[PDB]
Write an enzyme that holds these catalytic residues in place. Structure first.
Site: not given
Lengths: 263, 263
Positions: A103, A230, A232
């Protein structure tokens, strides 16, 4: 061996702000069966302000940064530490250290590139400087009907690969597309993307519209990639996400063998 | 407590090159009854060349430097590390860290002063740069009869105090003069001394002729002095020499009390 990663950031002051991020790293650590050190480097400590304030911490932070095997500049909020963040980015790029930006980190990486490659030292993020000569990072929210104003891009969205020649694509398994978690508002100014296309900063992932950029892979670098999405959130002990696993592999200096071995 | 001192230099790579110097420090450590750490910082590690080469060592050196209680830039030979040496000097001056320079160190300190106070950034030592716009450090050898060429100033010589208002004089015991070991060839260019007289860089000690400068005391600094002569040769466990004892006292932040207490 213990592979260490330099978590560079704001909120990086130890907290569990990164619990799922570290956990994602743990997934990779388990796969590879190595040990994992999380360094917590306040990006602010990488700045010359800190040098002025407490140069012990200043030099300590940079010492730690160098001692790290790879670096991670995740997303974050606030103008704070942006300088140290970018400095870390440029450092990793120059030193050819495994770099993963997420990001904000990706956004800043692009700015850094522009500044120290295109010479556009006044390139900046409009997130923090509305008076930017080269608006690299621009507010590009979604404007869905029924909404007043724009909204942050959020949710599981589909990202398309722009090319087959992509390390990440290979890590994913030659998929034509991938679906990932999204949470982000600012995007690459295409006005300058086109000035980055003749450059070795290649944009690999795009939203379905082909407008917002999601993946960037710096060419001629052992490992320097940035993502907006994202991963994760989707990484699991059984199926670790590949940007962290790949980062680990680069941090180790195994990745080329890995892919060569058969991915 | 263990008081640490940053030995900054060339030959500073651990050796016993400084055995009598450290021993002199030990004399002071015993007097004050504190413990003593000798840091060995290659001045070269303080240079940006090192940053480029191994920034771990670079930042480590500076981290150590800051962690030191006082700093010592002794004499030495060779152009090597001059930059890091001067950087350390400026650092200590800016940070108001106890600074003792000896011979070369004093010489460089004066140059540093000129550069960053008088703005004479091209000020230099003719020892290493014959093309110097402001020859601060100039070759001033002795020309005794029977000698061909000049010779290095060497031996137990008498140094005269130029003033009563001298911290060192006080440490010595209000002596009108002192006799010390000498071993040095380059001296202050008086052409610029006169430009340093209106400055807060005050020259306190002079040879008998009143020509060569032996002691300098920077005003408005907790402890920033330089000597050409070599007191470590005369320091004894019973009678420690005062520039090391005083340095220790400054490193501790005892010195003012000491003098106040009665010297």
């Amino acid at each position: 061996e213990t592979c260490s990663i330099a978590l560079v950031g704001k909120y990086t002051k130890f907290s569990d702000s990164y619990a799922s991020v570290i956990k994602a790293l743990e997934h990779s650590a388990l796969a590879i069966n190595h040990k994992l050190e999380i360094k917590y480097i306040d990006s602010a400590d990488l700045e010359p302000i800190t040098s002025q304030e407490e140069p012990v911490r200043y030099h300590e932070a940079w010492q730690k940064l160098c001692s790290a095997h790879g670096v991670l500049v995740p997303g974050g909020f606030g103008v704070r530490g942006t300088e140290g963040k970018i400095q870390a980015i440029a450092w990793a790029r120059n030193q050819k250290k495994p770099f993963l930006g997420v990001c904000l980190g990706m956004q800043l990486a692009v700015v850094e590139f522009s500044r120290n490659v295109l010479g556009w030292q006044d390139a900046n993020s409009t997130e923090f400087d509305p008076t930017t000569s080269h608006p690299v990072v621009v507010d590009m929210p979604e404007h869905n009907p029924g909404q007043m104003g724009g909204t942050m891009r959020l949710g599981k969205r589909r990202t398309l690969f722009q090319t087959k020649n992509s390390v990440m694509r290979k890590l994913y398994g030659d998929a034509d597309y991938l679906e990932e978690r999204h949470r982000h508002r600012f995007e690459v100014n295409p006005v300058w993307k086109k000035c980055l296309e003749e450059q070795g900063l290649k944009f690999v992932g795009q939203d379905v519209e082909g407008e917002r950029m999601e993946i960037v892979e710096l060419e001629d670098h052992p490992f320097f990639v940035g993502v907006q999405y994202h991963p994760e959130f989707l990484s699991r002990p059984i199926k670790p996400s590949p940007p962290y696993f790949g980062l680990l592999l680069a941090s180790v200096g195994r990745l080329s063998h890995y892919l060569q071995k058969g991915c």
